[PDB]
Structure 1
Amino acid sequence: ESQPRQNFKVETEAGINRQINLELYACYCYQSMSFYFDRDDVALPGFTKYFKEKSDEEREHAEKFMKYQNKRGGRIVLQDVKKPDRDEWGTGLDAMQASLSLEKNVNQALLDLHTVGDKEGDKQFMDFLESDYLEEQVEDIKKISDHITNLKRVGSGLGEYMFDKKSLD
């Protein structure tokens, strides 16, 4: 057993390694999204910047889980990060809805990972998940929902152009 390991179960360790891969996958999706909106036939610089920032956030999420794995005495096992499931992301509305669905899937995986910690009695891990992940997911999912509502409100064309300027920095 590694020196720090205490109240840290193998199932919790394995759950963290699957979550690392999922956060890396989300980071990859957002990176794809960002450079899609940098296409010359898409050309929405607010969307480009917004998904780039979201991509860096997911990379931070993954690395924080890596750091935590080490803190508790687990061992990081990396896997292929799959390519995103689309090459092209439609309109700003489509991308924002794909992003909502993505964040809700990450949130469910996090809640399932909380359930592993809870049944194993990992008090510290539950609070770590709560403080550093669950609250952020809830804020993010609310923010993206608002954006979807406004992208429906403004419509295509000028509306989408104006949303890019006024709702995304």
Structure 2
Amino acid sequence: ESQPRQNFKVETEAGINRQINLELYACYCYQSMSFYFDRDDVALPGFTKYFKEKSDEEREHAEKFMKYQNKRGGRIVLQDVKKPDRDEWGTGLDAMQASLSLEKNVNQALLDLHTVGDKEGDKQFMDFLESDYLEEQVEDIKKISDHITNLKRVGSGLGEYMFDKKSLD
């Protein structure tokens, strides 16, 4: 049993390992989305920058979980991170919709992870999830929903172009 290990159950440890993979998968999806919008026939640099930052955030999410795994004395077990479910992400609206779905799936997995720590009485892990993940997920999800609304509002073509310039830096 590892030296730091205390109130840290195997199922909590395993859940963090699955969440790590999921965070890495999200990072991969955003990375795919970013360079999708960098395609010359897409060429939306706001979306490219936005998803690249999103990708880096998910990388941070994964690594913070790996860091946390080690903090608690769990052992990081990495899995294949699957290629994202699409190669092309449609319009800015489609990608933002796909991002919302992605973030909601990550959020659900985080809430499921919280339930694991909750049922195991892992008080520290629960607060770690709450403070470091659940809040950001809620912010991200609201933010992406806002983007989806605006991408619907502005419409295709010039609207999507303007959204790229005005809603994303």
- The answer to whether TM tops 0.5 is yes
Partner deviation per Cα, 1:71-123 (whole Å, 9 max, x = no partner):
01110100000000100000000000000000000000000000000111000
Give the length in aligned residue pairs. 169
- Residue 54 of structure 1 and its aligned partner are, at CA, apart by 0.2
The CA deviation string for residues 13-62 of structure 1, in whole angstroms up to 9 with x for no partner, is 00000000000000000000000000111110100000000000000000
Cα distance in 1 between the residues matched to 2:89 and 2:163:
17
Unmatched 5+ stretches in structure 1: none
Name the SS for the 2:7 alignment partner: coil
List structure 1 segments (4+ residues) > 4 angstroms apart after TM superposition: none
Residue 5 (structure 1) shift: 0.6
| CA apart distance, 1:146 | 0.4
Looking at structure 2, the residues matched to 95 and 137 of structure 1 have their Cα atoms a distance apart, in angstroms, of 17
TM-score (norm 1): 0.99
What secondary structure sits across from 1:24 in the alignment? Answer: helix
Whole-Å Cα distance in 1 between the matches of residues 131 and 103 of structure 2? 17
- 5+ long unaligned stretches in structure 2: none
Percent of counterpart pairs with the same letter?
A: 100
* Separation (CA, whole Å) in 2 of partners of 1:11 and 1:97: 32
Q: Distance in 1 between matches of 2:15 and 2:165?
A: 40
Structure 1: how far apart are the matches of 2:155 and 2:2?
Answer: 56
SS in 2 for 1:87: coil
3-state SS in 1 of match to 2:108: helix
Task: Tell me the CA shift for residue 165 of structure 1.
Answer: 0.5
SS in 2 for 1:144: helix
Give 2:108's aligned residue: 108
Post-superposition offset of 1:7: 0.7
Which secondary structure does the structure 1 equivalent of 2:156 belong to?
A: coil
Q: Please give the alpha-carbon distance, in whole angstroms, between the structure 2 residues aligned to 1:11 and 1:166.
A: 44
The TM-score with structure 2 as length reference comes to 0.99
Q: CA deviation at 1:159?
A: 0.6
Q: For 1:76 and 1:157, how far apart are their aligned partners in 2? A: 45
C-alpha RMSD of the superposition = 0.4
